[PDB]
Design a protein around this ligand. Structure first.
Ligand SMILES: OC[C@H]1O[C@H](OC[C@H]2O[C@H](O[C@H]3[C@H](O)[C@@H](O)[C@@H](O[C@H]4[C@H](O)[C@@H](O)[C@@H](O[C@H]5[C@H](O)[C@@H](O)[C@@H](O)O[C@@H]5CO)O[C@@H]4CO)O[C@@H]3CO)[C@H](O)[C@@H](O)[C@@H]2O)[C@H](O)[C@@H](O)[C@@H]1O
Ligand SMILES: OC[C@H]1O[C@@H](O)[C@H](O)[C@@H](O)[C@@H]1O
Ligand SMILES: [Ca+2]
Length: 854
């Protein structure tokens, strides 16, 4: 033919001239037409570099075509000579005649080609297309139907939106109206097999499958084998990388244990017993301490029934501590500290009975909830403030407000009675307590550079624990708002024991806590036990008008008091109100001359063939340290990499009685993630290089840090994160449905969608996954064949080591939180059929394209 409008056709019907996603077309993608023109008269053939946006040629409707013409004429593509002025376009809409819309669009393409010529490139055009697309609901975030759009929405302090999800469903249809994404089909995706619902027949926990990100299908037997690979890797990190050969993790902090198929918890425990013989061997179990993060109390029962392969997280204790001691007003009664925990501590005088557990005053997420509350307070009328309208400047403002408020007596945001919360935590029996980095240090400064105001109080309590805390526990109300928590000492079982250990006489502790700042002054009697008659006690911590004293300076009691002939200690107390105490805090320990360490060895406790973890004096001797904050800043030098600062201070952590060091998730972070902390990772096996460190440092540094912690006598756990990955660079065409956090379809303001092609980011994993994914499966099968013959509960089948995961894609994923791309990107023709490019491996339908690009 002669030259003309037919040159709008695609240069060729394949991937060399039409971008596509598994054969489907996206309205925001570009294509190479055969030719282009600036006036409709002279037409120029296209080089391989001359690509154009599809939104110049096709649209999902007449409405959107009219908006496009309108928008471009109002943003630099006005030309009176081609019938395109602000006046000529002001009234056009979906009901404008078809032939004049097509004419206006053709003339606009000429006007656009003139702009491309003038600007010597498509750079401005590309920005104008992106700016236009953001104003069209079906081509942008709002059509995904966020809960944030609801009238008078209240943002959630968690900073995630639980019900903003989509599931990936099967679709092997031959109907072009439904499309086909069969490469992403699965025989698994068993969702919500969480905690006691592992077998699908007890949802008394109602714990959700979905949190945030791309949710991994931990019911897929190939995925379950890959988790064993990943565990084995981390447990031998340093020697498998050729880095420090003692730079190997000893165990795991298990992220999101309530939100993944519980099979993986059974399987992790099995692996670690195969490798280290933990079951029935407290010394081996305790050397490989592992503990599960969760806020559902039903996990205690689950873990007991399983023989306790990991520690239960006692969140009840945290909420009790905050409700009793931490509020400004409407404090719960002091007695709740006795009863409202997974362990009742009224008179706790036995061992191997309580649910093995870990407890805390603060963790990284709880500090975040406070900071996000503050952000929401500071910037009301911004409903999506916790989603896409979040700005780091709001966090900075909140942190400045927090540090100021933390120093006040009348705190508006920060917790009251932080020292007393710790005094209870670190004296409690039948728990492994967990101290938070950000309660010892100002967590937004460079790593460990600024001590927190609570550093002195908490570190005093930490050292005394190692020296003194052992034996039975009794907690007793002395009045309606004040309590004494007493430990009787190593080898002292209860208040009536004489003591059976050489350290019995000189160990034990009394912690006095009240939560009424107006409490009248009075005397109180504390029962130290029969092993502690006529004995001198030191005033470790007492309260003063302005704070705490560590040497009985200007407090109600002197530096030493002595018990009577029955073991009763007599003490004076009253209510105070200062930045450290709202109520009262007192701590008493026996006076001693030298060093003392009351740790009980695991070789000396009762072994039980059916238990891994047992709550006894040996396990109680452990203390966990959370080494990070979400708001930890990017380092300013190699010397300030957390890993190097940590290695340098190894002896400090040992001196504070820390036995188990919880290291942040060390994985390569998604660069655009909110915090760059490691839970939003793109590569599960790359833990940073010298050229490209993570927030915390390089892999080589990590291995040296672990070795240095081992040299100081500590064991080290890695935060293992099976639930989600975030930041995949590869898009895939998936078939999806709008759901809540359990994968059940919902409506949002009366609207919904189901079985729709969505161009989600799903594919990636980095070179770490390529190299290390499944690498160790052959050897694990050779050494521990039972791992791949034991039928898992949720599926009834063993993990499958015959397939290696070198690259993640949707077939291994349950779904995703909303990705802010739009549900209408997928090109449909007028009749509703999906457009499709039959090329290469994409054979699902015959090539079918819009008529505008022939
Ligand atoms: O073209 C731009 C960009 O596009 C792609 O990336 C899109 C990305 O979308 C999805 O991930 C986003 C997610 O859906 C959002 O909810 C949001 O996640 C936030 C949380 O909202 C936030 O609270 C926090 O989460 C942490 C918790 O607070 C904490 O308690 C603990 O549990 O750790 C959590 C994990 O960090 O931070 C996350 C992360 O910011 O933002 C997400 C994206 O930032 C989808 O899952 C991703 O796979 C998609 O990549 C391209 O990938 C990208 O290359 C391109 O530049
Ligand atoms: O942004 C669209 C881009 O698509 C690529 O496939 C082309 O090679 C680029 O020249 C073009 O600009
Ligand atoms: Ca999950």
């Amino acid at each position: 033919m002669g030259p003309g409008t037919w040159e709008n056709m695609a240069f060729a019907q394949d991937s060399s001239a039409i971008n596509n996603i598994d054969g489907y077309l996206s309205y925001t993608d570009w294509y190479r037409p055969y030719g282009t023109s600036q006036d409709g008269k002279t037409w120029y053939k296209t080089t391989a570099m001359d690509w154009r946006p599809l939104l110049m040629y096709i649209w999902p409707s007449k409405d959107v075509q009219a908006q496009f013409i309108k928008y471009f004429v109002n943003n630099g593509y006005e030309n009176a000579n081609y019938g395109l002025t602000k006046d000529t376009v002001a009234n056009i809409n979906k009901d404008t005649n078809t032939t004049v819309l097509a004419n206006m669009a053709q003339n606009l393409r000429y006007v656009i080609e003139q702009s491309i010529a003038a600007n010597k490139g498509t750079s401005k055009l590309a920005n104008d297309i992106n700016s236009f697309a953001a104003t069209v609901p079906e081509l942008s975030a709002s059509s995904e139907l966020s809960l944030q759009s609801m009238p008078n929405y209240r943002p959630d302090k968690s900073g995630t939106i639980d019900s903003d999800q989509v599931i990936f469903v099967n679709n092997n249809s031959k109907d072009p109206r439904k499309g086909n994404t069969s490469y992403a089909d699965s025989n698994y995706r068993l969702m919500n097999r969480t905690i006691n619902n592992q077998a699908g027949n007890n949802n008394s926990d109602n714990s959700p499958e979905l949190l945030v990100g791309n949710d991994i299908d931990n019911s897929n037997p190939v995925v379950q084998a890959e988790n064993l690979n990943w565990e084995y890797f981390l447990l031998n990190y340093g020697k498998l990388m050729g880095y420090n050969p003692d730079g190997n993790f000893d165990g795991f902090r298990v992220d999101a244990a309530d939100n993944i198929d519980a099979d993986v918890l059974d399987q992790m425990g099995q692996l670690m017993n195969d490798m280290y013989h933990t079951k029935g061997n407290p010394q081996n179990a305790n050397d490989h301490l592992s503990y599960n993060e969760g806020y559902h109390s039903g996990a205690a029962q689950m873990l007991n029934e399983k023989g306790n392969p990991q520690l239960y997280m006692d969140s009840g204790e945290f909420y009790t501590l905050e409700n009793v001691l931490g509020r400004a007003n409407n404090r719960d009664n002091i007695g709740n500290l006795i009863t409202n925990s997974i362990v009742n501590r009224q008179n706790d005088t036995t061992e191997n009975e309580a649910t093995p557990n870990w407890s805390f005053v603060t963790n990284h997420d709880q500090r975040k909830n406070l900071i996000n509350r503050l952000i929401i307070k500071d910037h009301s009328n911004i409903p999506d403030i916790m989603g896409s309208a979040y700005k780091v400047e709001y966090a900075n403002q909140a942190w400045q407000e927090f540090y100021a408020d933390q120093e006040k007596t009348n705190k508006q945001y920060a917790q009251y009675n932080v020292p007393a919360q710790y005094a209870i935590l670190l004296s409690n029996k039948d728990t492994v307590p967990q101290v938070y980095y950000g309660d010892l240090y100002n967590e937004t400064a460079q790593y460990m550079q600024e001590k927190s105001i609570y550093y002195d109080a908490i570190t005093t309590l930490m050292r005394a624990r190692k020296q003194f805390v052992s034996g039975g526990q009794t907690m007793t109300k002395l009045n309606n708002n004040l309590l004494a928590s007493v430990r009787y000492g190593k080898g002292v079982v209860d208040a009536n024991s004489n003591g059976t250990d050489k350290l019995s006489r000189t160990s034990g502790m009394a912690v006095l806590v009240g939560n009424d700042s107006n409490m009248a002054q009075q005397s109180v009697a504390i029962n130290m036990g029969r092993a502690h008659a006529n004995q001198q006690y030191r005033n470790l911590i007492d309260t003063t008008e302005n704070g705490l004293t560590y040497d009985a300076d200007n407090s109600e009691n002197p530096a030493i008091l002595t018990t009577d002939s029955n073991g009763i200690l007599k003490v004076t107390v009253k209510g105070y109100s200062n930045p450290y105490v709202s109520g009262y805090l007192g701590v008493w320990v026996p006076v001693i001359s030298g060093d003392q360490d009351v740790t009980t060895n695991a070789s000396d406790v009762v072994a039980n063939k059916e238990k891994t973890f047992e709550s006894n004096a040996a396990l109680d001797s452990h203390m966990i340290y959370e080494d990070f904050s979400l708001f930890q800043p990017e380092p300013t030098s190699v010397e300030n990499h957390a890993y190097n600062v940590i290695a340098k201070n190894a002896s400090l952590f040992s001196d504070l009685g820390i036995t188990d060091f919880w290291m942040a998730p060390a994985y390569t972070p998604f660069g655009r993630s909110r915090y760059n902390e490691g839970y939003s990772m793109t590569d599960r096996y790359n833990l940073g290089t010298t050229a490209n460190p993570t927030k915390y440092g390089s892999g080589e540094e990590l291995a040296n840090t672990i070795a240095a912690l081992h040299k100081a006598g500590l064991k080290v756990q890695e935060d293992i994160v099976m639930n989600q990955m975030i930041g995949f660079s590869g898009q895939e065409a998936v078939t999806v449905t709008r759901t809540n956090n359990r994968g059940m379809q919902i409506h949002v303001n009366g609207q919904t969608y189901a079985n729709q092609i969505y161009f989600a980011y799903t594919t990636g994993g980095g070179n770490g996954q390529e190299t290390y994914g499944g690498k160790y499966l052959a050897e694990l099968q050779k050494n521990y064949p039972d791992l791949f013959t034991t039928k898992a509960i949720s599926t009834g089948v063993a993990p499958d080591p015959t397939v290696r995961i070198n690259k993640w894609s949707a077939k291994y994923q349950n779904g995703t939180s909303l990705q802010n791309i739009g549900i209408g990107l997928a090109v449909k023709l007028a009749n509703g059929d999906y457009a499709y490019l039959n090329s290469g491996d994409n054979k699902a339908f015959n090539t079918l394209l819009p008529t505008a690009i022939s």
